[PDB]
Ligand binder design. Structure first.
Ligand SMILES: CCc1c2c(nc3ccc(O)cc13)-c1cc3c(c(=O)n1C2)COC(=O)[C@]3(O)CC
Ligand SMILES: CC(C)CCC[C@@H](C)[C@H]1CC[C@H]2[C@@H]3CC=C4C[C@@H](O)CC[C@]4(C)[C@H]3CC[C@]12C
Ligand SMILES: CC(C)CCC[C@@H](C)[C@H]1CC[C@H]2[C@@H]3CC=C4C[C@@H](O)CC[C@]4(C)[C@H]3CC[C@]12C
Lengths: 566, 566
């Protein structure tokens, strides 16, 4: 299975102008600087770029590239897109779990996992965690092998590598490059964009194609490259590295004048003659939903440095709130006291979900690469992570909260009120996380995602039934009370709270009482806040919060789905 | 003026083990990998490392290095430590302004600024801004020249360069390296740690010293380097770069076995013979305070992208608060309304000073390099930046705040109360910025500095006279009300606010009124909050905030002063 390409015109400014040539089923390479069209060529030959600006055709052994070309052809990304806090065994099981289980059994596909672990030579650390900047594990030289080995389980005919020696301890860099020479013995087409090979792997090159500023310099084998520029006009004598002299022509010891000599060279004309003669999902839904939810859950308690950080600051917050309000009295200092704390617990939960923005952006390149390679549909990924790293995570600043705070105060001595308060505190937390997830899903940096959300949770903090008394502002702006998350929190936390008790000792003020502006009963206080006293009015917020969840989640589901993934 | 060095033993593990050798008043170089003792040698030869682990001696032309060796010897740092948003002219004026004005006039030192701009060749873009990742300006090839030219105004005998070709568009890299060859024609000792020269500047090397894993490989001139390893055992034939073959011996095509041949080589023995024969502030305070305050002030409105961002979100916040509370009534819904907003304005100002942590950490390497080179004392830098980027910056979320909010509510229709509220809102803002400055000065990353401070401004948010009613909690924890910034805000903002008005229409409740729990008068409300009613009790917070400022600023002044600056 060979690749070939003819007259590629690519506009965003034409970035890939006049590229054409063939490959060989061996070890191909893309050379040149990073400023040129070197990296942009390999993306278009791997169908990574969009076909909008594409004009030329890529012919694999004469046939055009089919729709599932990206399903069968692995593309190793430049950075470590391996999961850092996972075992290398189950790291390799994951990519095997979504591309292959349509027909074959589990114990049928187990053998090719054990096959690719030995031809990679990765049985040595096969039961170790990979390692990241947070936690250690397997060394960085074998992190690239895990990226390469991950894309070998489904059967490849072409294999791509995006800059495979970017900072790989060059004494260790050669071993993986010999392995690709060892991988090409089966017939794997290895097209990579290598960044400055010195001389060692430069003699083990089967074919090469050097580019500069969007212009083809030269295509040909490495044994034919040394005799080229000596017959072109710039000499490369002794103590002059070949792969670094070939870029010295565009340093200027002009930009197109070197590229013309290749047209009337004895390399390009016979590639045109062979170009002219060749010119004339897969896995079930519930199988996908399990496995991606298995990964992030294992990723969560594989690195429990930021998960248990939220638990401890919650348990210490609840004890501190419990130590502050250790027994709340029904005196005149009750209303300022119990509406104060029940304000605080919602707007904590609305604000402590600032750290829900790091859910789709710390693994965005883990999402774009795994979606476009064909692992799963988007709604499988999105439903997978929510019930794995938003549902069990944001369910315990809530049920851990009430049990440590409601018994240290004695808010309302019941069990339904203990069970409705526990319900709504996890309901705000699911909302304002998703609100923070809505305006942060499908972005690259967390920077403007935190600044935009935090200034949005201030206007929600104002309209919350505490700092305003919403009934008193004018109706041309009091419509903004509905566009606020913790108001639905604070109302629901108050409606189950002011129902039977009297903040008026020594007197009773039900219907016959003089001397108003008293606010003795809480039901008198609630109409000062204008809260309706119906039992519908309690659950009116929860459906309003539940419909706040759905519109915020599907706009996040839209934003990942309509993401420019090329 | 030549440098020499003998038997350097350096422990943190011995990192610089057995280094010795001489220099030449020309162009010296330090070679090897980044993993070795290459970068750590140049720091010790520039007196950048601490002399704690140092054992050997560095002899400059036989004399030991004096105390003000660092005053006369420039050290160019690896990254661009030039000020990005400043003009190249005034960028070069700055370093001239602090090292030279002790005797000579301003118009005497102006000539050497015009002298070093032409021998650098930087008159072409001399009136342009430098440029950063935020705003453009002079291209990145001439950013390194501005770092080099900055350390030339005071007269150098030795000049250091920390890795001067780290990503400098290698076609442009040669021009600055020829300039150092052109600079060495005067007699400037140029010792740099160059990272992988290919061949071009490798022939323009006067002396070189290659190191590996803390072991000296070889010291000598570049013309004597090519004949070394051919007479040592590993051959470097044609199409083999010399500077990359010299590191290939430690790749292994062992770690000390190559380093032994240098001991019985004809290079080291005659350097020992010459080593054995050589073996036997400045500127006023107020002149320093002006110039550093001129720099950051010019840096502030040189990049007014984040300065005017805070102004607009302030003016839009004040209009929104003004639109919400457009006329606050003296009904029963006054106390919840006016204590609500006056809670919000303090805890905004306490929280909106989260962005004061980026004051000593976005330019920390701009501080360590400029302190140790001898530009100023620390208290000059610390008093310089506060009245330039904390005092005029955090004075206008306050006086811009009251004028847009006090007239849209009519809080207390006076002019003293307008002038005490404007005073205290800038007093909280100066406090909680410095509180955020205290636990962030002298750190490298803003990450744990934001997480620690924001969870600290929650416990200050609770004990604030709103969510607690501080008089009702037990005295074993109510001592924590004093360790909270905006309580002093909220009390002082309330004491000038509840003094003459009555939230009790149709009745008067001064001393003769039945039907308690009424809170008609505000002075009755203040003793429900337990605020003392003395006019001392108003200003009691401001001195408590002013003494909060001093202890937080001098712990920041201590933290910069006792910083490990080696
Ligand atoms: C409810 C406690 C609470 C708050 C904030 N953050 C938290 C974070 C974690 C946590 O557990 C509890 C938090 C926060 C932030 C800000 C303001 C504010 O009132 N609060 C309150 C005012 O407005 C601002 O600009 C902003 O600084 C936004 C950055
Ligand atoms: C795109 C973003 C802003 C959508 C915001 C969602 C909010 C504004 C929408 C979604 C669901 C809606 C709520 C669902 C139904 C009810 C119950 C009714 O008795 C009061 C209005 C109320 C509470 C609606 C108010 C507006 C609402 C809360
Ligand atoms: C190291 C950090 C925690 C220091 C914190 C500064 C605070 C806690 C210190 C510094 C200055 C001190 C205040 C200065 C004087 C007064 C006025 C007095 O009538 C009440 C106590 C009060 C208000 C002090 C309380 C404690 C205080 C506020």
């Amino acid at each position: 299975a060979v690749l070939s390409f003819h007259n590629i015109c690519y506009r965003v400014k034409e970035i890939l102008s006049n590229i054409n040539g063939i490959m060989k089923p061996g070890l191909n390479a893309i050379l040149g600087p990073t400023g040129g069209g070197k990296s942009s060529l390999l993306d278009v030959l791997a169908a990574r770029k969009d076909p909008s600006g594409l004009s030329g055709d890529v012919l694999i052994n004469g046939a055009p590239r089919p729709a599932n070309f990206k399903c069968n052809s692995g593309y190793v990304v430049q950075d470590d897109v391996v999961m850092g806090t996972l075992t290398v065994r189950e790291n390799l099981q994951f990519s095997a779990a979504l591309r292959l289980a349509t027909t074959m059994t589990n114990h049928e596909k187990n053998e090719r996992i054990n096959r690719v672990i030995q031809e990679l030579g990765l049985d040595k650390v096969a039961d170790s965690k990979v390692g990241t900047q947070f936690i250690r594990g397997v060394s960085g030289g074998e992190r690239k092998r895990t990226s390469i080995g991950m894309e070998l389980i489904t059967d490849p005919s072409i294999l791509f590598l995006d800059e495979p020696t970017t900072g790989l301890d060059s004494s260790t860099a050669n071993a993986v490059l010999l392995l690709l020479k060892r991988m090409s013995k089966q017939g794997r087409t290895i097209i990579f964009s290598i960044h400055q090979p010195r001389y060692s792997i430069f003699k083990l090159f089967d074919s090469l194609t050097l580019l500069a500023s969007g212009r083809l310099m030269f295509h040909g084998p490495a044994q034919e490259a040394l005799g080229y520029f000596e017959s072109a006009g710039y000499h490369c004598e002794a103590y002059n590295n070949p792969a670094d002299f070939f870029l010295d022509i565009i340093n200027g010891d002009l930009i197109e004048k070197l590229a013309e000599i290749y047209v009337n060279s004895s390399f390009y004309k016979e590639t045109k003659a062979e170009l002219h003669q060749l010119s004339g999902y897969t896995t079930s839904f519930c199988h996908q939903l399990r496995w991606v939810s298995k990964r992030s859950f294992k990723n969560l308690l594989g690195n429990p440095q930021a998960s248990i950080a939220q638990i401890i600051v919650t348990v210490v917050l609840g004890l501190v709130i419990g130590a502050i309000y250790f027994g709340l009295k029904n005196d005149s200092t009750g209303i300022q006291n119990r509406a104060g704390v029940l304000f605080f617990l919602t707007t904590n939960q609305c604000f402590s979900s600032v750290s829900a923005v790091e859910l789709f952006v710390v693994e965005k390149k883990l999402f774009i690469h795994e979606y476009i390679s064909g692992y799963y549909r988007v709604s499988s990924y999105f439903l997978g992570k929510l019930l794995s790293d938003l549902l069990p995570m944001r369910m315990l600043p809530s049920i851990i909260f009430t049990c440590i705070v409601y018994f240290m105060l004695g808010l309302k001595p019941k069990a339904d009120a203990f069970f409705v308060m526990m319900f709504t505190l996890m309901m705000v937390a699911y909302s304002a996380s998703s609100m923070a997830l809505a305006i942060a899903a499908g972005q690259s940096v967390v920077s403007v995602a935190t600044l935009l959300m935090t200034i949005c949770f201030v206007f929600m903090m104002i309209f919350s039934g505490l700092l305003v008394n919403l009934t008193t502002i004018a109706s041309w702006l009091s419509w903004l009370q509905y566009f606020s998350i913790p108001r639905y929190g604070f109302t629901a936390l108050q409606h189950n709270e002011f129902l039977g008790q009297n903040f008026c000792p020594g007197l009773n003020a039900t219907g016959n009482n003089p001397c108003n502006y008293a606010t003795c009963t809480g039901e008198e206080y609630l109409v000062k806040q204008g809260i309706d006293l119906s039992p519908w009015g309690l659950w009116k917020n929860h459906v309003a919060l539940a419909c706040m969840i759905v519109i915020f989640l599907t706009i996040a589901y839209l934003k990942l789905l309509f993401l420019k993934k090329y």
